[PDB]
Amino acid sequence: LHPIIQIDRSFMLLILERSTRSILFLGKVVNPTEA
Amino acid sequence: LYKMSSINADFAFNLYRRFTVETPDKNIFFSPVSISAALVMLSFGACCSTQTEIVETLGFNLTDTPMVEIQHGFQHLICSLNFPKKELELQIGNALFIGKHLKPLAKFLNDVKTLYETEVFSTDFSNISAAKQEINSHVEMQTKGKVVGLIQDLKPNTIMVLVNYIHFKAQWANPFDPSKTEDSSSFLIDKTTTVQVPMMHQMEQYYHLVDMELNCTVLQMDYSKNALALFVLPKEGQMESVEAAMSSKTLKKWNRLLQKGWVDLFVPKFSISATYDLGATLLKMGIQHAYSENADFSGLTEDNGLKLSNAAHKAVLHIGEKGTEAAGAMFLEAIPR
Numbered sequence: 242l243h244p245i246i247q248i249d250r251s252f253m254l255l256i257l258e259r260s261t262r263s264i265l266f267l268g269k270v271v272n273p274t275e276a
Numbered sequence: 277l278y279k280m281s282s283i284n285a286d287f288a289f290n291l292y293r294r295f296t297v298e299t300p301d302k303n304i305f306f307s308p309v310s311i312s313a314a315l316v317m318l319s320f321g322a323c324c325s326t327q328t329e330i331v332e333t334l335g336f337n338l339t340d341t342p343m344v345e346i347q348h349g350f351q352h353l354i355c356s357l358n359f360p361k362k363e364l365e366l367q368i369g370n371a372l373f374i375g376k377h378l379k380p381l382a383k384f385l386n387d388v389k390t391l392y393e394t395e396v397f398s399t400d401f402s403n404i405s406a407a408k409q410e411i412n413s414h415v416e417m418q419t420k421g422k423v424v425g426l427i428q429d430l431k432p433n434t435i436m437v438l439v440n441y442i443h444f445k446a447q448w449a450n451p452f453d454p455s456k457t458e459d460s461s462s463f464l465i466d467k468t469t470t471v472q473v474p475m476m477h478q479m480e481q482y483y484h485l486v487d488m489e490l491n492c493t494v495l496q497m498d499y500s501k502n503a504l505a506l507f508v509l510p511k512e513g514q515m516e517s518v519e520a521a522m523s524s525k526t527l528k529k530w531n532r533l534l535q536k537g538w539v540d541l542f543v544p545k546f547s548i549s550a551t552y553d554l555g556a557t558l559l560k561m562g563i564q565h566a567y568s569e570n571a572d573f574s575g576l577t578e579d580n581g582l583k584l585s586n587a588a589h590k591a592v593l594h595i596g597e598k599g600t601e602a603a604g605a606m607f608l609e610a611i612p613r
């Protein structure tokens with residue numbers, strides 16, 4: 242009965258620190274094997 | 277702090293949108309906090325319109341938050357991010373490489389050292405190549421080997437370099453089991469094209485949601501202490517409209533709506549890296565006088581002898597079964613005024 246989440250196409254990523262509510266890193270992965 | 281971090285978030289997203297115009301349909305990866313920290317530090321020594329422009333480009337309004345509150349907020353921010361936390365590595369620091377013949381105000385030096393942890397190095401920029409290696413090596417060391425070769429080219433007349441570096445390493449609250457990782461799974465890179473990536477797989481409870489306005493799935497994976505990752509997965513062909521909506525207001529909404537529940541979750545194992553020449557971008561966004569021959573950094577040196585010439589960022593990311601390791605570094609170059 243559980244939703245499937247498949248990160249299998251382009252996605253945005255945020256890495257956040259909780260106490261300061263800072264965005265440490267921000268990005269979009271279009272091609273995770275690129276370069 | 278949160279009203280600061282909210283302005284810092286909207287700067288992040290505005291800059292992100294500039295990048296999706298400069299390098300479109302390509303990987304984007306940066307540390308907004310690294311870029312903001314470096315520029316705020318550059319503002320500490322600036323005066324008048326030079327200082328005003330920098331912080332306004334950073335997204336602050338000097339009526340709502342006077343210059344001193346901004347300075348004090350960023351000092352408390354860096355201090356907080358660096359505070360020792362169990363089971364999470366996070367360090368953001370900076371270094372000022374000062375030309376042998378510059379006249380830095382010992383005020384500005386003592387204050388960056390004591391208030392932003394700044395490390396100060398007298399640098400022989402008459403050996404431009406050796407100086408470049410020294411800075412690059414310092415950044416590599418401070419990012420635990422992850423940011424290599426930050427400065428590709430360094431102008432022969434450089435007389436100051438300001439560097440900021442951030443390193444992050446953390447374990448997922450719920451690590452993936454590598455025996456359940458699929459060696460080769462499809463990832464759609466455009467309408468009709470796939471690449472093969474390792475796909476990690478876990479069945480656990482996660483905070484997640486479907487944003488019904490924006491038509492994207494938001495998935496939160498916590499790190500074991502004080503940090504989280506948000507994955508934002510648009511419906512097919514909806515990425516531009518999600519990008520246009522990203523903002524602090526949107527993050528606040530998701531913070532409210534995210535609900536924990538069971539998920540059958542597949543996440544790719546991968547690494548990326550990105551580099552940005554930020555010179556022209558920053559001029560456009562409103563940082564003008566800092567580049568001109570009438571730049572006012574009278575808080576920095578006795579003779580106000582310098583101007584900004586170049587700026588660049590490099591960031592790298594690795595996500596695997598155990599957690600995430602990420603790093604970034606910001607580079608601001610000054611030459612004679």
Ligand SMILES: Cc1cccc(Nc2ccccc2C(=O)O)c1C
Pocket residue numbers: 257258259262263264281282285504506524525527528530531534
């Ligand atoms: C606006 C903003 C900016 C940076 C971090 C936060 N915090 C979150 C935003 C969305 C989802 C989760 C969080 C969180 O830190 O729990 C917020 C609300």
